[PDB]
Structures are given as structure tokens and as C-alpha cells.
């Protein structure tokens, strides 16, 4: 088994991120899957869910740092929103560590491959998540 | 502050005199000392982490099981206690491929080290977690002085893992002799090695000891009426080093050496006798002459 | 009608077939829904890969195109051009990274790279599956250029600019253009006088037509899009006349603040009311407020009472169409390898102190002397690469001219001083340009300047003396080396100027691993930015010397005036709007967005929200948050983004 | 003069491998950073009066060369950490310099002194023992005659021998249990 | 190419093929200058555009015609490596 | 270890003021062009069988070590030319 992971990236810093640490043969697991948005503040509690129940065992979210967003101030709304997507997710018995969110600029190739190295390694650890195949009965 | 002492193997079974002046140093600062029943070497990593590295990191691991059973971290008096086991301590916290392989051999011991265990030094203790002016209220009889730091390699660094500020430039030891009322007097290659580290001094005696006495020559040529250390491999190589400088190089220098719970002992209206200053080779009794 | 789509899957010579399974991936591609042609090419960009697609979409009717290739950030403009030609609209057109994103960074599991790729594809054929003709919005380009920066690569910017006939606006922090070409004494490998040669271009800067010239002036704020942009220019207060005041400098006299000389790096002592350099364009005098007592003695001697505390900041606001980004770099700040020493022994200086010293109109009056005992030193140690290849303060990177800079002004002592011992202590000589080997050789053979290969591991001051030892192996010969100098010069590297964070935020760019500003493409598009509009010139955009600079300069003006010249471009439609039937007028959406598009309006006799589409950049943040659905970001719809991520775990 | 027939191309690989999991797979394998400036050399206090040169030895391992493993000069090394707190290419020098007197140790190049040491914690669990010196001074100062210490407490040393045996430390110091001495 | 490592096709082809269809852009391949005369602003040059012995604007680039090619050629393009036909083009990507 | 009291700052400039005018000051001083390639001791059959490196005495010269004029490796060379034939700084 190995985990299927979902990524959120921005357009403008984490995805120059991403593609700097593949300028750099900066190798990482490849379990995650990244899917492009112009913003971090694109994304709202629902993509998230939705990975969830398709079957995701993690979920990546990673926009500009704060300050350096493209547009300004849309990392600041999805930063509100996904600490309260934290702990709704332990409600639903969705353990915390499953979603991770970070500040990744372009020019950050070595964290974004660490991320991606840390990410995978805690959700291998965590075993598959098992909402997909309660929710099949 | 509750801390489990580990003791080592010098100061216990050659430089006694620092542990007594260890306990009671920090006994007026207010930290209980817990003893650490069946500690080893830690072992030494200069010698042992040369010779096997997985056997440095087993045994390691061993001795800070001890500690984390007993819910309590460690505080050492010894550069070279507090290098083995504060890489240890952190390189099992930080790979776990090492770890795997040391608790599937502490198993053969009914141990298992779970990354609980803090490892602290004596003099970084007192500089963030006690405060220096508490060194100072403290002081009955001020040491004026001069004093030829030796702050040890195996204290400041690795820089990246101890987090201790700067292994250049560095201002804790100097501060804390100060406080006491003595001078840290600037010398030639300060931050330099004492020779004895690495398995030197066993292997490579007078390599060992050239260096030494560089740093001797540096330290009276700045004025020092002392050398003051955090580490009793420092303390022998620096005090027995001399009866042998003398012996093969002809250098005679009657240069006192301490160990700085020896010195702080002083400041606290210590008595001599208690600090086994007798048990020096070298005599320190010019240094009590002055003050 | 039901999609139809091509999927094109590239190897990229090796790069992603070496890894990823390109023949398997375009067989998996084709048990997808919708997906009726599915190739594998080498190339899809070449020629014979463009017209592959092309020729496909006319024959196979295709209303979708897949790309399984590199970053769309590489090549999206590239294949969104190449479909259109073949008559499919721009955005049925969706890109998958498989290089970058797969290929680069999976190369040791090749099995699970291959996998992954299918998911990537299929994610791709779920969204471009819903995706939905857009009209590119073709917007008017205003007739006028901004040029951020007064150095030599932002000052040439502006004269190609001018001179093709574009208004053109430059504007320069300090009180003086120049940059620090203005602080060098000579230039490499001619060792012209720097000021000599640059005065002429700054003269033609401040006197030409079409250039505006914002002295001791920032950038404060830049909104809207490519020829499209209003920016807010704010010309600080000098607190003195332009009209009225002579520029001959009667008035630091009588001050009291004595005020680190930057322009001198701090070696000598300026007054609070100064002028930075003698020749400073513009030449007009300045008085620093931060540093002002304001005690009030300059103003009793000042005759043409020029002096005004009053004088208050004015903002100019501005409508450019482009804007170019040349605000340069500073020098490394060696204190953090305090093994070296620097700020802690007096007669360790930087190169750019050096350059200060050696220059006559500098605060020594051009004679390079200890500042310890201000004696001349006759033997000097240069050490290069201070900040630079260097992982333990963070800089990897290599600071391009240090080895020529030391071996120039190594040059420029021994004419002044022949006796002088000059050793370099250096790890590779990099003297890569035309004329620099020449140089190099010049610098030994001819003024017997001495070369150490062995990057110095510490410095020792002799506290008697003030003297320096420098320690490092000769590794030419395997020996360990402690020799004596009288001053010690770091050949510190370059970093970005400490303003570059506010550009940064200003402008919206990224930023290089060397913390440096990000071009599109290092070989595409060397001083363009993935920020439409907006381009690089100079050391802003890494280390490089005069030459590159403006290089760069002339390049940047180039593509610059590629939308004036054209007068119209077109942004991309990917644009919010409202749907008034779902819309009850909330209220959340309007603070959300930082440049006010959404607003509260009434329609139908009913309060409803509406969104204006020119305000508007596509960030996406107003339809995240909006409660209703009702508002959606075309090209990124809910809808589309959750086929995505079902497309990850099964086709649909 | 070198030839090809004189190197050994696994050598550094040999080096990294030792180096696993102990101290570290990217610790060791940073060897292959260096670009021989000598900043180590020139921070090196044993290298101030001996003919050991540290990039010397980084290079000799880069380039294959075995003769570094029987060499005398890897073992003047104190491990003081200086080159690596200085060297740009972040070498994790001291750690590789202790890898590389392992396979030293393998090859049977152990100094004897340093076989003694060792022998001294598994025999009595310190490298430096306890005398009666330390129990007569130990009574002049008011500590107990005998230290804590794994030395008077052969449950722990039992703990040792077991690991040690678990380790192959023994034979590989070439001791003998019984007779208690050294091959 | 370095440091990117990208192949030379990912950023040179995609500018050769807008280069050959740019609307103020003339290519004049296999053609060389042969005269030029004047001064700034006022050059009067002679291209001499040689022949191929194909024309162009029928030719399709297919290249079935190599194939049947009987004689080889020291290919130019490849430094004298691979051997090409005497009807030939320079590279696949040409 | 090498100290600067150890060194002679000028034997470069005694080499080439020796060798003027004979062979000449532009011959001898070509010196200062060396840039420590080694082509010369790869070229050198002395080399292959003793401890001489000819790009060392080279290099000895110009940092100062005058142990070079007391040294028995400068009369190891058999003046073959080689050296000079491949060495491209154009030393002589
Ligand atoms: C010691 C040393 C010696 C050198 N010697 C040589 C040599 O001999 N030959 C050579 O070719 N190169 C040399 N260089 C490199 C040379 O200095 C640069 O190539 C050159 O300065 C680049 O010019 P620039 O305009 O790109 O950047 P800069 O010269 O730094 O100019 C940038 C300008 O923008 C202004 N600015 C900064 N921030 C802002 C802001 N927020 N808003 C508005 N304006 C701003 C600055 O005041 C400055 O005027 C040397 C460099 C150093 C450090
Ligand atoms: C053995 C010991 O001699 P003594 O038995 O103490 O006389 C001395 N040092 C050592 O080797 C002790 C081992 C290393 C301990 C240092 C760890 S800080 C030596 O051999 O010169
Ligand atoms: S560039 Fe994008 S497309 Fe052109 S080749 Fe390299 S990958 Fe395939
Ligand atoms: S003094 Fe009054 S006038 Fe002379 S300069 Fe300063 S201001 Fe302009
Ligand atoms: S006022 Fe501010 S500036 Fe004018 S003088 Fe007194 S101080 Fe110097
Ligand atoms: S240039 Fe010469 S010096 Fe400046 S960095 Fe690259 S190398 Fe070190
Ligand atoms: S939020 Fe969705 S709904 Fe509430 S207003 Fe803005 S749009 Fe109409
Ligand atoms: S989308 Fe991002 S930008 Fe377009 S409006 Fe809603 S917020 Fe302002
Ligand atoms: S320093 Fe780091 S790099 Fe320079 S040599 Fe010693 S090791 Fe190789
Ligand atoms: S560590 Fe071993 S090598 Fe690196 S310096 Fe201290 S001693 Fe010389
Ligand atoms: S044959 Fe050779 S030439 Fe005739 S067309 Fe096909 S290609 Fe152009
Ligand atoms: S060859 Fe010419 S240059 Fe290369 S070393 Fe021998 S001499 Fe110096
Ligand atoms: S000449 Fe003297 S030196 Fe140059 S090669 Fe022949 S021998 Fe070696
Ligand atoms: O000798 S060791 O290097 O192992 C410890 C130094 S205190
Ligand atoms: S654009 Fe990346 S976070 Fe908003
Ligand atoms: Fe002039």
C-alpha cells in the first residue's frame, strides 16, 4: 500500500517552487498529486472534504507566504479557513496530521522537496485513512 | 531543577575535587542533584565514535534510557559527556533508521530509549536557566584575577546542533568567570583545541601535548595567572600535560589549572581542601598566594 | 456536443521518457473517456509536434487538448498559441506537468512515476473535460514606461526607451542616480574611470524629452495589469528648493549630526544636509529628517533661506503600460564569518570599502591607508569569495565579478604603490568574459600580484600592531601558510538591496534560490517576469557586472516595448463573476477581494452582488468564500476543480 | 606515479555505507561536496605540526585511493569540529573523518594504546577506571568512596558485554573473554 | 542545456517555429548576404538566396524522398558522425 | 607550516634580474605568468621517478621559499624543453 496524496498549489510562488526543486533533481516520494490554482485563497473547505472522501490519505495545501501573495491577501482568508479545517476534521475523526499546509515561494525548492519527504512519511505512518470504504457499506 | 548527574569517567575517578565542588556549586543555585545509578562511559565520542559508530550510539542510548526511566533529564560537567550525549540524544530523536537499530539491540537488555531525555551542560545551564547574577549574589569571596578561558571544542559544537550561539566568538564562559569578579584575558587561538580530544593524548601523547602548550604559552603571554575549564579531560590534559611538558619538552611554566566549579567553589567561600586543589599535579598555591 | 480530446503525451528528448513510461502512458490515456487520439511524441513543442496537434484537431474534430509535458508556466502561451491556430479555443486546453512535477523528481522509482503520470493525465482529462470556451480580453496599452532604479542598467533602460520615442518615468531612491558603478573608482578589464564614462549617460537621463526623472522618490503602491498599470510615485521631502538652492553646500557647516556616509560605506562622517557624491545627478543638496535635530543652525546660515521643515511628501500618481525592475543589489555583510573578523579588527574592510577608499573623491582622498593607525599598508591579503559559495551563511551561489574586482583594484594599489605585497587567496579564478583571461594573466605577469589557491580558514590580528595573519592551506603545494599582512580585504559577494521586499510585494515577482528577483525562463525569457508587464535588468536579477547589466538593460527596454509598440495585449478571461438569480446580497465577498471588484448593487428590484470584471485579477479568493455558489471564477470553477480531484482516484 | 589498477572506485561509496545509519547516510555522503578549498587544513591545530593535511585526506577518499585507511594521519585528527564549523560546502568533515577510522579499525590499523581503551569499558564499563587513589581521595573530600557508577554495578556491565557481543566490538578489538586480554 | 537541463529543442524550436511565420519577419534560409552598401539608416544588400533544387512551396516535408536516396553524404550537422543523403534536411526538427 | 619570516618576497625578482640581459628579462620573467596547470609535470620524464614536480619549484619561487636555491630537485631537470614546448602561459 502507499498513500494517495492531493496537493493544492498556487500558481505563482508554491508552483515555482515545485518546479524549482525538479530544476534541481530534487527528489521526493511520489505519492502526491498536485492539482494548480491561481491562489491558496481559492481553496475553501470543500475541495478539501471532497479529497476526503474520494479516498485521499492526505491533503497538501501550500500557497505564497504571507505578505508575498500574488494577489495580495489571499493566502490570509485560506489561512483562517484551514485552521478551523483542522480541528472540524478531528470531529469527523479525521486525525489533524492528514491535511498539512505550508508557505513555500518560488525560490524555496529544498523546503518544498523536505515537505513533500515529511508529508509522506507521517501519512505512510498514519496508514491508509478508511472513510472511503465506511462510507461504500 | 531536578537534573540526574551524570558523573562520567575523569572527574569521578581521577578529579573528584570537581565533583564535590560540582555539588555544592549548584546546590546553593538551587538545583537538586539526583544520581544516576549504573551510568558508564557515555561513551567518550571522540575515541569510541572513532573505533565503531554504531557501538558509540548503542552505549549511548543505554545511558539515557537510564535517565528518561528515572523521568529526569540529564546535566553533565564534561564537554565530552555532553557532546556524546547530546548528539545522541538528538541524532535518535532525528533518524530513525538509527534508532531502529539501537533499541533492536537494547532489547536484548530490556531497554528502549523513546527521546524524552534533555541533555544539558553545567555552564549553559547557569547562563539560561539559572541567570548570571544569581552567580554573583552569591560570590563571598571575589576572585580578581586573570584568567585564561578554555571553553573546550566539544562545548559550543557542532553549532548546528547546539544551538549555543557562537564557537568563534563566544561570551558564556567569559561572563560567568567574570561574575566571580576575575578578568577573561584575550589570547592567542583561544577557541583552539587542548590536544587530548580524538583519542590524541592515548595515541599521539606529545601531539596531544604541543598543543596544549601553545595554548599555555598564549594564555601567560596574555597575562592568565590561571586556566579555567568546563571539562576534566581539559583539566588533566592541562594539568598532568604539564608534569609531562616538563618532563620531555623542558618547558616549566607552574601554570595553575581549575576546572570552573572549582573556581566558582572559591567565589562561594569554599575551602581549599574540599576542592582536592592537593590532588593537582601542578600547584595552584601560587594562584590562592593572589588571592 | 461531448468533448473530444487529444492527449499528447512528450518524452522531452529523455527527460521524461528516461523516467516515466510515455508509450504506457498514452495506452492508459486512451481507455479515458471523451479521449479519442492519444500520441506519444519526443518533442511537442518542435515543429513536428505542433503540427501534430494541429493536424489532429482538424482531422479528428477535437474540441480538447491535453498536454502531459513540462510546467504550463514554461509552455502554456506556447501550446495555448498553437491550438488556437488550428481554430480550438485557447482554454480547451489543459496542461499536465509530468517533467518538473514527475519525470525530474521521481527518477529512482520509475514504476510509481509512470503511475503517477497516468493520474496526472487523468486529472487533466477531468477538468478539461468541463473546461469552457473563453474570449481573451484585449485591453489598451498606455503609451508610457516606469523604470524602478537609477543605476546604470535602469538608467540605459529609459535612454533606449526615450530614445525609440516612449515616455518613460525612472525613479531612483536615493538623492542621486549612478547606483555603485557611481562608487567604483575603475572599471575591469579597461579600468576606465567608472564615473567618467557613466556621468555622460546620467546627464543624458536627466536632460532627455521623453524621461521624467523622480529623484529621492520610491514607488509606494502599483495596481491593475500589463498597460494597464496606476502607480503612485512618492517624492520624498528634501526640505529644501529645488528652484532655490544653489547645490554649494554652506549649510553642514553649522550642523551638529554627524551621519554614516552610505555612499562611502560608512567610512567617513557626512552632515545631517548633504549631497551623496560630488558628481550627483541631480546636484542639489538633501537633508536626512531621520537624523535631523531639528535645532534650526543650518537655517541661520543658509542665504536663500531654501530651508523648509514644512516641505511635505507629494505622490504623483501615474498610468504606465510596463514597467521595468532595476534596482540593483548591495554588498555582503561579512561580520556572520567572524572568523575573518570583520567589525572587530580594524584593517579587515570590504571590497567595497576599498573601492571607496581608493577612489579620489573618496573620504581618504584616494589613498588606501590602515584604520587603525591610518599608515599606508604595504602588504595586503585579498580573500575571495566572502558570501559566496558559501552554505554556511546561506549563499550557494557564485557573485560573478569578485575575481575580477580583486584582481582590479590589486591593479589600481601596485600603480599607486608599487612596493605593496597584494596575495589574492582564492579557489578558482574566474575570469570568463571577453578580455578577463587577458586580464588575469596582466594582473601576474605584468603587476606581480600574487595568487594563493586556498580559501583562508581564519584571520588573527596581532593587537600590538593592528596587523593581520591569514591562515590557509596552499593547497598547491600542501602546506599550511601564516602569512603577515597590513590589511586584509574581503571580496565579499553580492545579495539582493535591502528594498527588495518592498519591490517585491509592490510589483508581485518571485524570487531565485539566490534571493535574487525570477525571470520567466532563464534562457526563454531572460528579463521578462511571469507577472505580465513587468521585466528585469541588472544586478536585481542576480550577480553580473556593468556590462550585463546593460545588456540586460537594452533587453528589457526591447521587450518592454514590445506592448507599448503594439498599443494592445490581451489578459487572460479568468475572471470572477456573479450569478444575480443565486446571489441574496450577503455581503461577505465585497472586503474579500484587495482591489474592490465585488460590490453591492441592486438589481431586479432586489439587492444583488456584481463584480467588475476590470478590477478584477482571478485570485479566486471571493468565490471560495462566497455561501451562495453564486459566485464562480471562470477556468477554475467548484465544478471543474472537484472532477480534478476525483480524477486523481477514478475516471468519470 | 598512479594508475587506474591503484584506485579503488568504491571507496568513497565503501566510506558512506559505513556511515549508515550511523552517523547519518547525508552526513557522510557530503564527502562528495567538497571542492578542496583546505579551509579544513587550514583550521586543523594537529595539522600545524604534522604532516596530516584534512583535504588531503577528503581527496585521497574521492579519488580512491586505500592507502588512506593504513594511514597514521587520520588518527591525529582531535575531532575539535572546527572545519566543520568552517568548511562553505558544508562537509560534515569530523563525522567522515570518524567513519573513515572505522573501516581503519576493520582493517586491523588500531592503535594498541587505543585498543587498551576500549578494552577498559568492556572490561570495567570506563575508559578510565576507578583506582583505590580514587577511593582514599574520594574519602579525604566527603563522596562516597565509589562513584555510582556502572563500574560497581555489573548489572549494567552486564548490559555492556551483552551489547558489545551484539556489536562485534570485541572481535573487532580482538578480545578475548576468558583469559580476559586482548588477541 | 545548462543549468536547467531542459533539451535546446524546449526553448529553441517553439522560437523557430514563430520566427518562420512571424507577419514582419522575412526568412531567407540557405541564403547568404553578398553585398552591402551605404551607411546607417540607408543600406542598399544583395541576398544571394541559393538554391535547394526543391521548391519549397510544393515541398512537404515528408521525407519519403531520403529513403530512396542511393548515395551518402558526411552529414555537417552532426560533425561528420552520421552519414545523410544528398537530398536531405539538417535535422528532424528543422 | 610556512611563516612570512620564512619567505623571501622578491626571489621571483631575483630570478629575472639574474637572468637580465641574458637570456633576457622578458624570458625569465615570463615566470609571473605561470598559473599552476601542471601541464609541465605531467611532461617532465624526471617526474615519473623521482619526488620533482616541476610546476612546485615554479610555484616555490614565487611565494618566496628560497629553499629552492638550496634544493636538489632544480638539478633534476635535464633541460629536455618539454615543458616549455606544451605549457600554455608561454613560460619559459
Ligand atoms: C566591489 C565591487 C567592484 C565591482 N567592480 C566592477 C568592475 O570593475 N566592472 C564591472 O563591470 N562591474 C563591477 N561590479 C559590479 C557592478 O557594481 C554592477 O554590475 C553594477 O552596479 C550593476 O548596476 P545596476 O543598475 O544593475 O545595479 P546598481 O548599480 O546597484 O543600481 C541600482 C540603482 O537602483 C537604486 N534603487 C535601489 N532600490 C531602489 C528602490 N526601491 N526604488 C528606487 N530605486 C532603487 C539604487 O540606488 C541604484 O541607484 C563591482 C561590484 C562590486 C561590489
Ligand atoms: C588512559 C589515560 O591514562 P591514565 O590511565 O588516566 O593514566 C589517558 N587518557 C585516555 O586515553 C583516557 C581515554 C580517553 C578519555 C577522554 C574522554 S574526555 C592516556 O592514556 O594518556
Ligand atoms: S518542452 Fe515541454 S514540451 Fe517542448 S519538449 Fe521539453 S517538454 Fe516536451
Ligand atoms: S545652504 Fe541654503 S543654499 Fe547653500 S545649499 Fe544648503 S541650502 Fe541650498
Ligand atoms: S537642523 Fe537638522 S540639519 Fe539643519 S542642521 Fe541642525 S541638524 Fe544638521
Ligand atoms: S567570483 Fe571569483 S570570487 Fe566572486 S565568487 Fe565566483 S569565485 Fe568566489
Ligand atoms: S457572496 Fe456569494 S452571495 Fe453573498 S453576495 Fe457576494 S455573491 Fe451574492
Ligand atoms: S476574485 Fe480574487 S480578485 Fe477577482 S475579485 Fe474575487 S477577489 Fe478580487
Ligand atoms: S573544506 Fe569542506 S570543502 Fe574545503 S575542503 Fe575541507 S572539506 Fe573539502
Ligand atoms: S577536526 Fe580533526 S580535522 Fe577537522 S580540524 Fe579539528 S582536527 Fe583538524
Ligand atoms: S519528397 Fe522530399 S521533397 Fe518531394 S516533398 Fe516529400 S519531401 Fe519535400
Ligand atoms: S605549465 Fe606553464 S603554467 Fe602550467 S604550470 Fe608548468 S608552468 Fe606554470
Ligand atoms: S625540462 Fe627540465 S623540467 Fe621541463 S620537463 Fe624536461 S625536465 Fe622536467
Ligand atoms: O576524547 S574525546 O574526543 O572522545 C572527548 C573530548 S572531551
Ligand atoms: S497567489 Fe500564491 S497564495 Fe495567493
Ligand atoms: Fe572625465
Known amino acids: ?137 | 531543577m531536578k537534573y540526574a548527574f551524570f558523573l562520567g569517567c575523569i572527574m569521578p575517578n581521577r578529579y573528584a575535587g570537581v565533583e564535590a565542588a560540582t555539588r555544592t556549586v549548584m546546590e546553593k543555585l538551587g538545583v537538586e542533584l539526583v544520581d544516576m545509578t549504573g551510568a558508564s562511559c557515555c561513551p567518550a565520542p571522540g575515541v569510541f565514535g572513532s573505533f565503531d559508530q554504531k557501538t558509540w550510539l548503542t552505549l549511548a542510548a543505554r545511558n539515557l534510557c537510564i535517565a528518561e526511566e528515572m523521568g529526569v533529564d540529564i546535566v553533565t560537567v564534561c564537554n565530552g559527556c555532553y557532546g556524546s550525549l547530546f548528539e545522541a540524544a538528538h541524532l535518535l530523536h532525528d533518524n530513525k533508521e538509527a534508532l531502529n537499530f539501537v533499541n533492536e539491540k537494547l532489547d536484548k537488555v530490556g531497554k528502549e530509549y523513546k527521546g524524552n531525555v534533555k541533555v544539558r551542560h553545567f555552564a549553559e545551564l547557569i547562563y539560561n536557566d539559572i541567570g548570571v547574577d544569581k552567580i554573583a549574589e552569591k560570590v563571598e569571596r571575589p576572585l580578581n584575577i586573570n584568567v585564561g578561558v578554555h571553553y573546550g571544542c566539544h562545548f559550543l559544537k557542532p553549532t548546528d546542533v547546539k544551538h549555543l550561539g557562537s564557537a568563534e566568538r563566544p561570551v558564556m564562559l567569559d561572563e560567568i568567570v567574570e561574575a566571580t569578579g576575575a578578568k577573561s584575558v584575550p589570547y592567542a587561538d583561544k577557541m583552539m583545541c587542548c590536544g587530548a580530544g580524538g583519542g590524541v593524548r592515548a595515541r599521539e601523547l606529545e601531539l596531544s601535548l604541543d598543543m596544549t602548550n601553545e595554548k599555555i604559552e598564549n594564555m601567560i603571554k596574555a597575562g592568565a595567572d590561571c586556566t579555567v575549564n568546563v571539562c576534566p579531560f581539559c583539566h588533566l590534559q592541562f594539568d598532568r600535560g604539564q608534569i609531562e611538558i616538563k618532563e620531555k619538552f623542558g618547558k616549566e611554566y607552574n601554570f595553575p589549572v581549575l576546572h570552573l566549579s572549582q573556581l566558582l567553589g572559591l567565589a562561594m567561600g569554599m575551602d581549599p581542601k574540599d576542592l582536592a586543589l592537593s590532588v593537582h599535579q601542578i600547584s595552584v598555591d601560587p594562584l590562592l598566594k593572589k588571592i | 456536443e461531448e468533448p473530444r480530446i487529444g492527449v499528447y503525451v512528450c518524452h522531452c528528448g529523455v527527460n521524461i521518457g528516461g523516467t516515466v513510461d510515455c508509450p504506457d502512458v498514452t495506452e492508459f490515456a486512451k481507455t479515458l473517456k471523451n479521449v479519442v487520439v492519444a500520441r506519444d511524441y519526443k518533442y511537442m513543442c518542435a515543429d513536428p509536434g505542433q503540427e501534430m496537434i494541429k493536424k489532429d484537431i482538424k482531422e479528428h474534430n477535437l474540441n480538447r487538448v491535453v498536454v502531459a509535458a513540462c510546467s504550463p508556466r514554461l509552455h502554456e502561451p506556447t501550446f495555448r498559441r498553437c491550438v488556437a491556430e488550428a481554430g480550438l479555443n485557447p482554454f480547451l486546453f489543459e496542461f499536465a506537468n509530468i517533467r518538473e512535477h514527475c519525470s525530474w523528481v521521481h527518477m529512482h522509482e520509475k514504476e510509481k512515476a509512470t503511475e503517477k503520470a497516468k493520474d496526472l493525465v487523468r486529472m487533466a482529462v477531468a477538468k478539461a473535460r468541463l473546461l469552457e470556451p473563453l474570449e481573451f480580453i484585449k485591453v489598451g496599452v498606455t503609451q508610457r514606461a516606469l523604470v524602478i532604479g537609477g543605476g546604470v542598467a535602469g538608467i540605459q533602460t529609459a535612454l533606449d526607451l526615450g530614445d525609440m520615442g516612449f515616455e518613460t518615468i525612472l525613479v531612483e531612491k536615493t538623492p542621486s542616480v549612478g547606483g555603485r558603478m557611481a562608487q567604483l573608482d575603475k572599471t575591469f578589464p579597461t579600468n576606465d574611470c567608472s564615473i567618467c564614462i557613466l556621468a555622460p549617460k546620467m546627464v543624458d537621463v536627466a536632460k532627455h524629452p521623453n524621461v521624467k526623472l523622480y529623484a529621492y522618490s520610491e514607488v509606494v503602491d502599483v495596481q491593475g495589469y500589463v498597460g494597464n498599470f496606476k502607480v503612485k510615485i512618492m517624492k520624498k521631502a528634501r526640505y529644501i528648493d529645488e528652484t532655490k538652492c544653489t547645490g554649494c553646500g554652506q549649510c553642514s557647516e553649522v550642523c551638529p549630526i554627524d551621519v554614516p556616509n552610505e555612499f562611502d560605506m560608512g567610512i567617513g562622517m557626512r552632515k545631517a544636509i548633504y549631497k551623496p557624491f560630488p558628481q550627483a545627478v541631480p546636484a542639489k543638496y538633501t537633508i536626512d529628517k531621520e537624523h535631523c535635530i531639528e535645532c534650526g543652525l543650518c537655517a541661520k546660515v543658509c542665504g536663500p533661506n531654501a530651508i523648509d521643515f514644512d516641505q511635505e511628501p507629494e505622490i504623483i500618481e501615474a498610468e504606465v503600460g510596463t514597467i521595468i525592475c532595476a534596482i540593483g543589489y548591495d554588498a555582503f555583510d561579512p561580520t556572520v564569518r567572524e572568523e575573518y573578523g570583520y567589525g572587530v579588527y580594524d584593517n579587515v574592510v570590504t571590497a567595497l570599502e576599498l573601492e571607496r577608499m581608493i577612489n579620489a573623491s573618496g573620504p581618504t582622498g584616494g589613498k588606501v591607508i590602515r584604520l587603525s593607525d591610518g599608515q599606508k599598508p604595504k602588504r595586503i591579503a585579498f580573500i575571495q569569495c566572502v558570501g559566496s559559495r558559501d552554505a554556511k551563511v546561506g549563499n550557494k551561489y557564485c557573485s560573478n565579478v569578485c575575481c575580477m574586482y580583486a584582481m582590479k583594484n590589486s591593479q589600481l594599489i601596485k600603480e599607486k604603490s608599487p612596493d605593496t605585497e597584494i596575495d589574492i587567496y582564492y579557489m578558482d579564478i574566474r575570469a570568463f568574459s571577453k578580455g578577463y583571461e587577458e586580464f588575469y594573466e596582466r594582473s601576474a605577469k605584468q603587476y606581480g600580484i600574487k595568487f594563493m589557491r586556498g580559501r583562508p580558514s581564519q584571520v588573527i590580528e596581532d593587537p600590538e600592531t593592528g596587523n593581520l595573519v591569514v591562515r590557509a592551506e596552499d593547497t598547491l603545494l600542501g602546506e599550511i601558510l601564516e602569512k603577515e599582512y597590513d590589511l586584509v580585504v574581503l571580496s565579499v559577494g553580492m545579495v539582493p538591496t535591502k528594498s527588495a521586499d518592498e519591490v517585491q510585494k509592490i510589483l508581485g515577482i518571485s524570487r531565485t534560490p539566490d534571493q535574487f528577483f525570477m525571470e520567466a525562463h532563464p534562457k526563454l525569457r531572460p528579463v521578462d517576469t511571469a507577472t505580465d508587464g513587468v521585466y528585469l535588468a541588472g544586478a536585481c536579477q542576480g550577480p553580473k557586472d556593468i556590462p550585463a547589466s546593460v545588456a540586460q538593460g537594452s533587453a528589457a527596454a526591447s521587450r518592454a516595448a514590445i506592448p507599448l509598440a503594439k498599443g494592445e495585449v490581451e489578459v487572460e478571461p479568468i475572471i470572477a463573476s456573479v450569478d444575480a438569480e443565486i446571489c441574496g446580497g450577503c455581503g461577505v465577498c465585497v472586503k474579500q477581494c484587495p482591489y474592490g471588484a465585488p460590490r453591492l448593487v441592486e438589481k431586479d428590484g432586489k439587492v444583488v452582488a456584481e463584480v467588475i470584471s476590470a478590477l478584477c485579477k482571478g485570485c479566486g479568493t471571493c468565490p471560495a468564500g462566497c455561501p451562495s455558489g453564486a459566485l464562480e471564477q471562470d477556468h477554475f470553477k467548484t465544478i471543474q476543480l472537484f472532477k480534478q480531484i476525483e480524477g486523481m482516484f477514478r475516471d468519470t | 606515479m598512479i594508475y587506474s589498477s591503484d584506485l579503488n572506485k568504491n571507496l568513497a561509496s565503501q566510506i558512506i555505507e559505513a556511515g549508515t545509519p550511523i552517523p547519518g547516510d547525508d552526513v557522510v555522503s557530503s564527502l562528495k561536496a567538497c571542492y578542496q578549498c583546505g579551509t579544513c587544513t587550514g583550521s586543523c591545530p594537529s595539522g600545524r605540526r604534522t604532516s596530516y593535511r584534512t583535504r588531503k585526506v577528503i581527496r585521497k577518499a574521492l579519488l580512491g585511493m586505500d592507502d588512506v585507511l593504513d594511514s597514521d594521519d587520520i588518527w591525529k585528527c582531535t575531532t575539535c569540529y572546527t572545519c566543520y564549523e568552517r568548511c562553505p560546502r558544508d562537509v560534515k568533515v569530523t563525522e567522515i573523518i570518524k567513519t573513515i577510522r572505522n573501516l581503519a579499525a576493520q582493517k586491523g590499523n588500531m592503535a594498541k594504546a587505543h585498543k587498551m581503551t576500549a578494552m577498559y569499558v568492556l572490561k570495567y564499563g570506563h575508559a578510565v577506571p576507578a583506582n583505590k587513589n580514587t577511593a582514599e581521595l574520594r574519602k579525604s573530600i566527603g563522596l562516597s568512596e565509589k562513584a555510582p557508577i556502572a563500574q560497581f554495578s555489573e548489572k549494567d556491565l552486564n548490559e555492556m558485554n551483552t551489547l558489545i557481543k551484539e556489536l562485534g566490538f570485541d572481535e573487532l578489538i580482538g578480545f578475548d573473554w576468558e583469559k580476559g586480554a586482548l588477541k
Open chain 1, 1 to 137: 500500500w502507499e498513500p494517495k496524496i492531493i496537493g493544492f498549489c498556487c500558481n505563482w510562488c508554491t508552483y515555482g517552487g515545485a518546479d524549482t526543486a525538479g530544476v534541481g533533481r530534487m527528489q521526493y516520494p511520489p505519492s502526491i498529486r498536485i492539482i494548480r490554482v491561481m491562489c491558496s485563497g481559492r481553496i475553501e473547505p470543500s475541495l478539501i472534504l471532497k479529497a476526503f472522501k474520494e479516498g485521499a490519505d492526505g491533503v497538501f495545501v501550500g500557497g505564497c507566504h504571507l505578505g508575498d501573495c500574488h494577489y495580495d491577501s489571499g493566502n490570509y482568508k485560506w489561512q483562517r479557513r484551514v485552521m478551523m479545517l483542522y480541528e472540524l476534521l478531528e470531529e469527523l475523526g479525521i486525525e489533524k496530521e492528514r491535511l498539512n499546509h505550508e508557505w513555500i515561494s518560488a525560490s524555496e525548492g529544498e523546503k518544498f522537496q523536505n515537505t513533500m519527504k515529511d508529508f509522506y512519511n507521517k501519512i505512510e505512518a498514519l496508514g491508509p485513512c478508511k472513510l472511503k470504504e465506511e462510507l461504500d457499506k
